[PDB]
Write a protein that binds this ligand. Sequence first.
Ligand SMILES: O=c1[nH]cnc2c1ncn2[C@@H]1O[C@H](COP(=O)(O)O)[C@@H](O)[C@H]1O
Ligand SMILES: O=c1[nH]cnc2c1ncn2[C@@H]1O[C@H](COP(=O)(O)O)[C@@H](O)[C@H]1O
Ligand SMILES: NN1C(=O)N[C@@]2(O[C@H](CO)[C@@H](O)[C@H](O)[C@H]2O)C1=O
Ligand SMILES: NN1C(=O)N[C@@]2(O[C@H](CO)[C@@H](O)[C@H](O)[C@H]2O)C1=O
Ligand SMILES: *Cc1c(COP(=O)(O)O)cnc(C)c1O
Ligand SMILES: *Cc1c(COP(=O)(O)O)cnc(C)c1O
Lengths: 830, 830
Amino acid sequence: ISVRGLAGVENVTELKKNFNRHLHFTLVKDRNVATPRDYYFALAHTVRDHLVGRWIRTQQHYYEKDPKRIYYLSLEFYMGRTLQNTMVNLALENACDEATYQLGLDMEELEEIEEDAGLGNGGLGRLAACFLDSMATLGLAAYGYGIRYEFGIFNQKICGGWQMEEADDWLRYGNPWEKARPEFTLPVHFYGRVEHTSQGAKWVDTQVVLAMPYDTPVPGYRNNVVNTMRLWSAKAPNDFNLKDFNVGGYIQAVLDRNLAENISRVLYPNDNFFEGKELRLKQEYFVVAATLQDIIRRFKSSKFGCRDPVRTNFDAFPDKVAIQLNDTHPSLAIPELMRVLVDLERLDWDKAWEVTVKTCAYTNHTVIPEALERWPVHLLETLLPRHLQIIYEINQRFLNRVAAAFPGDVDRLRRMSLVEEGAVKRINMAHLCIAGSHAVNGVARIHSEILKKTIFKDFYELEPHKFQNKTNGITPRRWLVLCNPGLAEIIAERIGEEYISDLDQLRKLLSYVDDEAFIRDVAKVKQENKLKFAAYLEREYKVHINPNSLFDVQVKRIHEYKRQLLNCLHVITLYNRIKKEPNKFVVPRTVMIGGKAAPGYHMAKMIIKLITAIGDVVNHDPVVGDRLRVIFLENYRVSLAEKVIPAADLSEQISTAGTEASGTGNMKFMLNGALTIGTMDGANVEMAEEAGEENFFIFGMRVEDVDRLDQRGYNAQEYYDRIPELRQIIEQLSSGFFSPKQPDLFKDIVNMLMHHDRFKVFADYEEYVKCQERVSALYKNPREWTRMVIRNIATSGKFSSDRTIAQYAREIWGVEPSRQRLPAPDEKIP
Amino acid sequence: ISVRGLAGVENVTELKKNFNRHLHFTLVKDRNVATPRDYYFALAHTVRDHLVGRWIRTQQHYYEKDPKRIYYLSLEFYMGRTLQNTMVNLALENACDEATYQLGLDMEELEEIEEDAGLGNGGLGRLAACFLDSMATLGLAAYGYGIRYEFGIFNQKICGGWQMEEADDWLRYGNPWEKARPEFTLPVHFYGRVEHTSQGAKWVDTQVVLAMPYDTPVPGYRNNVVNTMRLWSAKAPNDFNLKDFNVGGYIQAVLDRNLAENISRVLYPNDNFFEGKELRLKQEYFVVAATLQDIIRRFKSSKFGCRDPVRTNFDAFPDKVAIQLNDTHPSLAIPELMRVLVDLERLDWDKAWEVTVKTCAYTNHTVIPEALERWPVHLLETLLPRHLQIIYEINQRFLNRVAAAFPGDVDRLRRMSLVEEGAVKRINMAHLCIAGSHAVNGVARIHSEILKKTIFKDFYELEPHKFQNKTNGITPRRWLVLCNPGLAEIIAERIGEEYISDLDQLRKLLSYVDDEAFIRDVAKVKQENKLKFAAYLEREYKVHINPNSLFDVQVKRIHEYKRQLLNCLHVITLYNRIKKEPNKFVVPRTVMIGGKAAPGYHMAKMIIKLITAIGDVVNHDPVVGDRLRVIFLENYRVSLAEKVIPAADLSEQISTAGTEASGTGNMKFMLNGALTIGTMDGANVEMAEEAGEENFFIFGMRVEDVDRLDQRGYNAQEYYDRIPELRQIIEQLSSGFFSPKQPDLFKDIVNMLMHHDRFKVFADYEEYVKCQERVSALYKNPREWTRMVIRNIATSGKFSSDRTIAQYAREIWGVEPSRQRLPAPDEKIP
Ligand SMILES: O=c1[nH]cnc2c1ncn2[C@@H]1O[C@H](COP(=O)(O)O)[C@@H](O)[C@H]1O
Ligand SMILES: O=c1[nH]cnc2c1ncn2[C@@H]1O[C@H](COP(=O)(O)O)[C@@H](O)[C@H]1O
Ligand SMILES: NN1C(=O)N[C@@]2(O[C@H](CO)[C@@H](O)[C@H](O)[C@H]2O)C1=O
Ligand SMILES: NN1C(=O)N[C@@]2(O[C@H](CO)[C@@H](O)[C@H](O)[C@H]2O)C1=O
Ligand SMILES: *Cc1c(COP(=O)(O)O)cnc(C)c1O
Ligand SMILES: *Cc1c(COP(=O)(O)O)cnc(C)c1O
């Protein structure tokens, strides 16, 4: 059937009876009233049974051996569905497929019923998920720590061409994967004041919110390791949230508990944008405070909570603990670790600071200013008074370091301060992370260099040793074996299965680049993938596409820096050229644009409307026929990505050079047989470098050119003046060609494009359509297109998150990865 | 060990491995980290497994045979713990005891970990629970329908002698008994307006709240019948509760969902008191609207949703459906049933009314005016506009009936109206229930007569056939076999086990009233019970009592009509007599008073303070010694009741004649070997009548005497003037003898007692202490006390809820009870 494992005789039988046990005993249903949703749950529970045994021994193991623990703190974990992924990592896919078949059910139909765990916005959240899978696969004692939002990223609905947001109640029917651990509930403080008494400061008169943990299993790939993702939920204490007496109302007091519990209710839908709301800051301290107590507790036990030197010496803390800050979101972990060590454990400042710097590491994910976290001091002052005091003291000491290193450099001092003066004083979270971490890293080679040369130049001059790079990657498991079994099988037919956990081995496919059967096969799976997606489209969304055309897709969050608008300009150009010479042949294309816009991002929502507006015109023009279709992919999410990416021919990664930190979608397309058209931005550079620029479609300004243009001054009118085709499009938008009933509908886009384009869309227009002509030319030659595809796939190995994690492990965390199978799952009950 | 069933070889082994399966697979724990709470859950899950098989076949059975269905609507279901009860009804107690013993665990210790399902206030809620158990035991196709509050009756804490209320988060660790059924979620409407168009009225522009059902199993006693209790939970729709666009905030919209979900958040803590809050009215319509849709759906399928006459003829509705209104709380079911039949199904008014009256029945539980539900019209007008219109039309037609029957009786017309004019117009819910039901019943013979003679006299003259009586009862399972296995065993040793489901057989114990061994045994179990309670007391609450003294207990909600104050007056009298003649012998007593006061009931909370104040003085007076102890039983609830009642010698049922509708605690004490001192009120009359007045300690005014006194006018000063002992107590309270630091602390009590005592406490004082002397005299003669006890126990059979339900079944619902074992639980998987 494929190498989705063995469909053993004893195990298919075993699976079937357990499926039935659960349908009866767990779901309390009988075959005569069971619906597909019930069947999905029976299976889910049956599969989950197979990893509890391993989950328990993995955790017990780490307790016995006591290795250095890795704590990945992130406010986002974009997990997606977990049924198939679990089957894949446990080699259970074919057995389950067989068994459910024998029970007369279609497994694929059941898999479609599982709701996505959308606890993320985009790249940042998905990176965390990929990392977790890799850390488990490489046998690291790692823990993912985050917030269990009851409402994840909103589900997007297109009404009249506009995006409509609606609550993502992903828990409505329950989550069979999580395990509530109310017994490990912890208290988290807010507000209050600071008392300075005799021997130390005291954080007093605080409001208490309880953090209840929920553990979800993270299985490694076929190695019997099952790590843990611990998500915190906010709960109100039953005392003060009722007991602070003297009139108000008993009923009202009980209803008001949903005020402390609102902390974990919803994820902020902002991608690469900072909103200084109090609720967000509360979420940030909440995850940090709860997690740290859990970390220290585990450390207090270790082998120190037995003997060792005997005296809670936190000197070995950094040798046993490593906490990674996914962006500045969990940045309060720094002053919080200090508060506990100094205020509660009573360590002197300097010893505490040494420990803190040695255990914390920070990862930066963007250079755009509006995404930078700068919290107003009056907010921290009210909500976390002691932390503010600690931050000021950290700043005081750090700046003294600077003064000593650069005597008399008074501007450098203000530039480097963690405290920003002006309208309202703010705390630069990024500056805090750099000062309190022993390593700072970018997510792509160019991004990392940009940090050193630009944004964090002064900090680099101060401590050059802190700055590193760790190019992002994706998991070959979910992003290849899971979503594209067809491609995985044909690769395995030639080079084996060891590449799934050693992606570099894909290089061996280079020697099949002239193999006639392989070229035919690679081309076949892609055709099968396109046919399946074209079908899904009519199934779930309804109104035809042509599977023979080139599948041109751009799927990622809607942003001005991602330039979906530049993609739009090209689409309209194709249309206009067709309308000019109707009877001239052109390579057919289905351009699919999908992504979500943050609710308050007006421009982004305007762009979504533009895309659907273009499709209204283009898709109903008889002269165009089936040569050009414009489709907006609704509710883009992880599960939808697993469907489009394997069916894509052209991947669009056209951000303005220097704005996309790394990107990861690009890597997903490369490993799945799509050719890439893009700019020398983020990881695109390393991808072209790995596959050879001849096998990549690069165009546009490089970072240097962008800067040259900024010195000069960017004037879009120039481009409008010298390119008639560009002029024609802008006047089409301006006159209502794309919006008849509301002719001035797109005035904001045009106005922006002509007067305040921060991402110089026009500057890359000419070179973009010129480059687009080149890919069309090559698509006309199936054999050569596929051969270039094989050059990309065969060379994408470097982009596996296993590589990324192994680097973090060795160069930052100080631990050694291991592909050693944990001693089976085997029963056991001590 | 006792007749807690057989501890079979095959089943103890089976139990043990399933206990282990769950500890591993369900709880995801290993013996080395498992806590008593984990062990409790493993067991709970193991026991729950045994009744799913029966639950499924019972429900399937009713679907096949299609009998008349009974729907018990109540806003309260005081269930208590459910582990032991389930073991008892499934004959699993000894097997579980053995198995857990073999696993090295104490079952009793684990049972103490289960949280009480406190979804009730007192008697009314507990009656519903007892009824459910009886309906399942008598093989009736009955369904309990209510609200799944996430916060039940508050947990009571005594701080400085005052009651402190704190949220009862009973779901904190989860509920292993319930089964969420998100797939049967239903929509419920609120607000909106009424459109009168061509062919009918339309309820339009409403706010939608979703009702998600949770089913809990209700096993009959050893008959394999497992009925269902369906509790509704409020959920916000994800559309409008987000989709009603045009600025407000996406985050805020999501946080505001906890506005529609507040409907099922907390139970109103009022016992016998009406609070006209909007949230309450919403809860009332919520449970009614959701339930009715469920009822009709089931009816539409029946055997009509196949064939029968073919044409949705609702003429057979009353033959297939019976809905019982537990008090007026679910009274909206009447106009709601009309709204659906008329507005949606399009039946003419008269046919709809005939159906409605024929399927609904109402049970009244109190005669005090302040407990009567009178909803302001402006509230119904805004929240349920169409229902108000229906109520007015029902009133219009009903009053025309009256006018026709009593021509010219203009005062009768206003008196009987469902609409009350005055300050603000109100709707008399009780009047609505009588008009729209074919049966109205009281809960005790005297209470029922009072309804006919007083409160509902006019309605009785109009339709005498509607009025009936159904004396309350309690379940011998939880209230005898479960809480008092020792007594149950010795009874079973002489007369067998058939009495558990046929309590009348207890009469056979009359012939052992002179049996020397039996008297010794009855006396022994009571001594063992007192020793165990005396121990629990020091265990969980701490500060000694004497097990040899007479256990004088009064446990019920704190009310002015229950007269805990009269009990107080007696206690103080005993104290004063001891202080007057210290070296004179008196029968030792431990008087235990326990109960909760509604949060806003100032007087009730003042009484709690008085009780603890008396104990402070009495319990620390050296001259008193161990002759007199005053203890306030904290957090009285079902589980606590199962502990005190079996250990009680004297039961206090001293409400003012004519105020306690029936009472059920009194019955609990009678069947557990306690002697009763009380007034001729509620069921006390039928109890004395059943056991013989010679075996009861009756005192005080009868209903007649109370009325005579009211004609005359009640003047408490008279009693104060003629009784020196009474005078001495009032002046002790007035001068601060019981409250040194705050001498005027109890001025409200004294003031009330002397000038506004609605329950004439002083009037029954003399006859009360005189009667108390008589019980002390009899306690001095152990042999005769026990013999009188045997006379009570042997004669309590009439007070089993099996009798009550059989009467409802035959005289109101029109169904026949059956003690037929359902065809085993046996596997099966169709
Ligand atoms: O005190 C202990 N005795 C034995 N095993 C322990 C103890 N503490 C932790 N463990 C084991 O280590 C696992 C790790 O628990 P953690 O504290 O959540 O990391 C637990 O599930 C147990 O298997
Ligand atoms: O359409 C049907 N076919 C077969 N069995 C049914 C059907 N509807 C209800 N049942 C059975 O009747 C039980 C009663 O379901 P209820 O509607 O919740 O009362 C179900 O759990 C099934 O066993
Ligand atoms: N939202 N979001 C960011 O703020 N930064 C991002 O992080 C990911 C993961 O490192 C990078 O690949 C993206 O280029 C970057 O934009 C991202 O996706
Ligand atoms: N709260 N509450 C009432 O409002 N009425 C009550 O109902 C129960 C059950 O019928 C009766 O036994 C009580 O006497 C009556 O007070 C009761 O306990
Ligand atoms: C991989 C992924 C992303 C990141 O895409 P980029 O193109 O790097 O912005 C965003 N959303 C989803 C659902 C993803 O799978
Ligand atoms: C039986 C019961 C009641 C009813 O007691 P009465 O004396 O009839 O008021 C109240 N509370 C609990 C916990 C009960 O078990």
